[PDB]
RNA sequence: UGACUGCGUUUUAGGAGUUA
């Protein structure tokens, strides 16, 4: 259904403890993660979330620790981090080296959402995908490529 | 039902609390 495949996607996403804040805001949030993690710094999730929230909140009041926490889980599910567990304390996390460019990181992010849609049996075309995730028709073939790699 | 806050999930995952 024309905007109800859309709300069922975000339902499936929220159910997996993840979240999409819209094309513009998601983009900044990811860039911020990269800013913190691309030089190989190692931050607990708590601190990483703080880093992003503190810069984003003043420009987007929808940006809570809770909501940004959910964006980061998207990347946790996508297996983007190198995790270092510590005894009696929280894990630190770094970006895997292959994911230290926006292009690369965003591919994985995107893929993870597609995969959630697949797990939930939601057939969605690349034209749609480019609208949902970018608000334009400029990423159809990017999204097509993601889809094809996922069914193999 | 939402929102929020912890802790957990790389052995892949949530779940508790607070609140209207």
Author numbering: 175 to 326
What do the authors of the reporting publication say about this deposited model?
The Roquin protein is essential in T cells for the prevention of autoimmune disease. We have recently reported structural and functional data of the Roquin-1 ROQ domain bound to a canonical constitutive decay element (CDE), a short stem loop (SL) that acts as a cis-regulatory RNA element in the 3′-untranslated regions (3′-UTRs) of target genes such as Tnf. The ROQ domain adopts an extended winged helix fold that engages predominantly non-sequence-specific protein–RNA contacts and mainly recognizes the shape of the canonical Tnf CDE RNA. Here we present structural and functional evidence for a greatly expanded repertoire of RNA elements that are regulated by Roquin as demonstrated with a novel U-rich hexaloop SL in the 3′-UTR of Ox40 bound to the Roquin-1 ROQ domain.
We set out to identify Roquin-bound RNA motifs in an unbiased manner by performing SELEX experiments. The structures of ROQ bound to the 20-mer ADE SL and to the 22-mer Ox40 ADE-like SL RNAs were refined to a resolution of 3.0 and 2.2 Å, respectively. In both structures the RNA adopts an SL fold, where the hexaloop is located in the vicinity of the carboxy-terminal end of ROQ helix α4 and the N-terminal part of β3. Notably, we also found an unambiguous imino proton signal for G15, but not G6, in the ADE SL, indicating a non-Watson–Crick G–G base pair at this position. On the other hand, comparison of ROQ domain binding with the ADE and with the ADE-like SL RNAs indicates almost identical NMR spectra and CSPs. In summary, similar to the CDE SL, both the ADE SL and ADE-like SL RNAs are recognized mainly by non-sequence-specific contacts. In this respect, it is interesting to note that symmetry-related RNA molecules of both Tnf CDE and ADE SL RNAs are found in the respective crystal lattice in a position that corresponds to the recognition of dsRNA in the B site111222.
